[PDB]
Subunit: 325 residues, 4 copies
């Protein structure tokens, strides 16, 4: 029989629309309901028994920790039922790497959780959303997909929430993991799996959102020539618990940045040095302040740091998380 | 006869050293002098008549607008003489894209200006520095190289200062221009040119640094879920003339970021929306505040914005610059 | 007023169809007529005055030199008229790099010649064909596009016929030029040009097809472990004028391949060593037999070799062509 | 205590040399002995107890199935001993993907088998071989490396024999797996593992070389415009058991190629359709003759087809191998 898939809608461009079919920019995201989306691709109903639920309807640049936290709890609830085999979450592309990674760390189930997005509005000529959604359901309902961590499906590719990121401001093929590749690809309606991530996630994660009602405050500061120190003062003075530094090269700091970090440290703020480059490993360096983000980019590093702080503030333990998650 | 090339040293990993040949991280950058570098690769002296000049010796994360401005003026002086055919600038990798792009816009000569860097210390096993320097001089002395804008040479590739960027925190092949490719490659001691950038630069640029002693203050703020508004207040309150926003997706802003931008606007601060993604075009959008950066990434966009402000503050003219430079 | 664009159809997947909207493989290419294509995207008629002409209707794997030669002559005729500003050629994806490069070398006009293809059948959910065609016409009608050589437009990118190639058997984003990047991109209905190829083409090419009725015979042989020598004998014995060798690494040959090449040489067959790798430069090597293909891949190298032979058989002159075209 | 690593040398550029340090092309591969290599990087002796064995000394374009078969048997012997923890095989770059994949399928051990190569001669300025060898030994001796299949280590990257391939004729960063990424990377002397391939290999493979003295004959034929049919006749007439077809796009065949394949089929020859593109999935198509290679490229597909024929000639079983290995 067909598997039972629930399609949780949060908004995004995949549900956006513009006045004309040639308008691919300046459209309104989160304008259509989940059912309109489902009826656009009726074929979806032959791959599984789908049920659409409207969790929200916004542009992903406005997604917040509060909402992501509730989204995570809602998905844990659904996955606990016996009449739910998998979940597909329609989301915006802009911050899908952030929400997808948060759930990658907090969903306590082996059942597939697949995020799907689209770079073109649903009203666009050659809109990518329909096929993306169709592929997402297919992946969600396949039993080969269990235990692979949270996945992002778009443009025939299946990426891990831990490595996948939006690398181009506006192309269809924007989502890639340059050094880590894709978990698999969907060609001709067959799924081809190629990798399994060698990291901890989902059912083997220590992070638990059941019981939380708010998350620690973590900001991201950029590293560049002449980077100001006052931005660190500002962050501290506003009660941030952690600071993710999108540094030059391999988390390199200027004299001004070092001053700001030392200050944040003597104030109890956790400093996580990452990179602005876009890919790669930020290796340990005792000569420099703060922890290092391993291969986590700024956006992902902020997510893992927020969660880590809901467990400990021990630098030694947090550094461990960053090398295993 | 051999061409006359001047090698201006500013420091960087290409002049760094560590206690052991297997230490590739945690070393000391800007530790060796230009002459030590020149003598390490004597072959260089058969490709041209070289003269080394020590401009500075620092880790590039500490390079500042002041030093870059003087560097730019120094290179204009040298290129004005008849006994100088080209210049090779040894620089750190971390902010080479910023310094190289600054000179790309302010050097008033058709003569080759080549930046060279290295990802491994000079004391490392398989240090890339020697061959990079050799290739740099070769490119600088070739007459085919005139009029191509400022170039960055490393790992057998020749990249435009306008497109090239450091994409990986720590690999040798870190420098790439995903959508724009390389101007050319150096294989087997022959130079293969393949592209000419379709942008304005050097001798056809309107920016002039002769006469300036300081640059406008421009900061970069990051875009992410829950991004704070107070960082905008902080920047404004510290007298920044412009703000480069490394936005989500195609320069998308959250409600908090929009508030902060509007505020900066009513305070006379120029707002330039760019992208944190790493590649791509941030297209115009009248629904949103600020200008758009075309394909300029945050680091490059800050450099062009600083220079534009030394000429005008007209949003219409600055937006033009961003589409032509 | 609107520019006059002619849309020459040759078949391909962009004109293919399958029984269901979810069938993306095993469909029938070259099934729809140019007018069906034009009417699918009416918006096209607001960008220019279009006239469709049905040149052929086949799957591109069956395109041959004869048909490409006639196609080239047909386009030269059309571009010679005053009421034609540009031409858009719908073609299959499989051998578009070969046909596009052939015309890149033989069309004697500065007017835009744009090839457009599609990876999904026209009857597919999220078919890429409509938007590709729309973008193609836009590029063809823009005056900024003159003198850039033949272009291939697909998936929002504009690639040079000389560098572009199909790198993936079946993804939408299959067309790339890893080392050379794209000439430009089309985002939000604006065209962003970034490069100009530094090679000879179109109006500055020495190759002329007016008057030819057939082309020299050139085959491609692969290089691998245990590659046989008898395939060279076979090719020679079948009257080939040239042999493009898709070699291991930088055009490396095994003892068996060297025997076969020497044999072909003493038989008057021109041997062009290329690479099977996919990208890069095959540098000169006097220790080995045959000419080297510069950065031309096997498919492109065969096209330039066929044309070169319609002019000379001088190894010295052909090698020159390969470094300038 | 230190692990016991054996370094089997087969030749290659990593052991090559040229008259000058600036000569990176036209050098002599397989010119130095394993001990010269070992003494060049003495640091290697602090990472493990190494023993060099000279299996051969040739340029990899001349490596053959016979030799690869013996190499595979020799490695199985060594890995069976208790005083051997891992093996590092120095090999040429040109056909390392072929030898590495052959062993990936026939080595019956969980112990690390690491292939290392180099793009620059050992006598070159900035030769990459030393650091590559150092990294290879480190990976071989780390216990985290067991059970990962055969690996190729070069340029700080660790790639799976199944996905890794040489993508550029002559750059240092030539080895990549565009869609599959790397198994891990080596930065700052620490190994960072990120993926585990989701394919069968080594101890879970059905292919056994113990007892074989020769391998089935398999050739590769290229697909392109005007591809001749006589090449198929030639292959058949020379007793090939299988034919790997490097086809256009997704294994597409011309009418001539179809004629040749049908002929090969009625003669008992197994036809495996692959792609010339360089990456991707060749999906099943009942409308076309022969089997499909999944994501295996021509070079890898030939290796798996040779081995498959040493077990069966059943099309249904061989097609299964191609989807699981």
């Amino acid at each position: 029989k067909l598997p039972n898939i629930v399609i949780l809608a949060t908004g995004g461009t995949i549900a956006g629309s513009a006045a004309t079919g040639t308008q691919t920019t300046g459209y309104k995201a989160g304008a259509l309901g989940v059912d309109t989306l489902i009826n656009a691709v009726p074929e979806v109903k032959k791959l599984a028994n789908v049920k659409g639920e409207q969790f929200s309807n916004m542009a992903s640049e406005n997604m917040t920790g509060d909402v992501v936290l509730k989204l995570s709890q809602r998905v844990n609830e659904l996955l606990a039922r016996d009449d739910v085999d998998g979940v597909v979450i329609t989301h915006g592309t802009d911050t899908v790497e952030e929400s997808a990674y948060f759930l990658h760390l907090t969903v306590k189930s082996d059942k597939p959780v697949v995020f799907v997005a689209a770079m073109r509005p649903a009203t666009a000529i050659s809109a990518d959303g329909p096929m993306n959604l169709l592929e997402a359901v297919r992946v969600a309902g396949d039993k080969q997909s269990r235990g692979r961590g949270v996945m992002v499906v778009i443009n025939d590719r299946i990426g891990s929430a831990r490595y996948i990121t939006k690398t181009n401001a506006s192309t269809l093929d924007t989502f890639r993991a340059n050094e880590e590749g894709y978990l698999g690809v969907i060609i001709g309606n067959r799924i081809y799996y190629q990798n399994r991530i060698d990291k901890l996630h989902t059912t083997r994660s220590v992070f638990d959102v059941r019981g939380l009602t708010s998350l620690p405050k973590v900001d991201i500061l950029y590293g560049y020539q002449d980077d100001p120190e006052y931005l660190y003062d500002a962050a501290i003075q506003h009660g941030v618990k952690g600071i993710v530094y999108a540094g030059m090269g391999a988390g390199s700091v200027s004299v001004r940045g070092i001053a700001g970090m030392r200050k944040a440290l003597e104030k109890g703020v956790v400093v996580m040095r990452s990179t602005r480059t876009g890919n790669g490993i930020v290796p340990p360096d005792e000569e420099l302040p703060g922890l290092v983000s391993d291969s986590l980019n700024p956006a992902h590093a902020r997510i893992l740091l927020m969660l880590a702080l809901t467990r400990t503030s021990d630098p030694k333990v947090i550094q461990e998380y960053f090398h295993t998650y």
